[PDB]
């Protein structure tokens, strides 16, 4: 149907926008602390601790299969990356501190993206 196509034009535009957002957010992690999932080989207990792991590459796989239906869903995943990190790691670590910085730097990007999504539908 033509109604179905039009939903698909909008999903595809959402995806284009969210790719820009994701790159912008990944630049706030120059150390690439959040680029890949935590290794179970290198942290075998990780799933005893964190129930929903998340990382930029897993967000990117989802994004390219147009699996984000809106910005809330994408914002939940981004917040997982930060929130998992601040639980697992202690306050005085390079990992926690990188989360805080990503959160603060990310919140700006996400403040304007929420306006660009509302603004352009």
From Swiss-Prot:
Cross-link type Glycyl lysine isopeptide (Lys-Gly) (interchain with G-Cter in SUMO2), residue numbers: 41
Domain Bromo: 9-113
Tissue: Highly expressed in testis.
Localization: Nucleus; Chromosome
Signal sequence residues: none
Top-rank lineage group of the source organism: Eukaryota
Coiled coil: none
Subunit composition and interactions: Component of some HBO1 complex composed of KAT7/HBO1, MEAF6, ING4 and BRD1/BRPF2. Component of the MOZ/MORF complex composed at least of ING5, KAT6A, KAT6B, MEAF6 and one of BRPF1, BRD1/BRPF2 and BRPF3. Interacts (via PHD-type zinc finger domain) with unmodified histone H3. Interacts (via PWWP domain) with dimethylated and trimethylated 'Lys-79' on histone H3.
Purpose: Scaffold subunit of various histone acetyltransferase (HAT) complexes, such as the MOZ/MORF and HBO1 complexes, that acts as a regulator of hematopoiesis. Plays a key role in HBO1 complex by directing KAT7/HBO1 specificity towards histone H3 'Lys-14' acetylation (H3K14ac), thereby promoting erythroid differentiation.
Protein name: Bromodomain-containing protein 1
Gene source species: Homo sapiens
Gene: BRD1
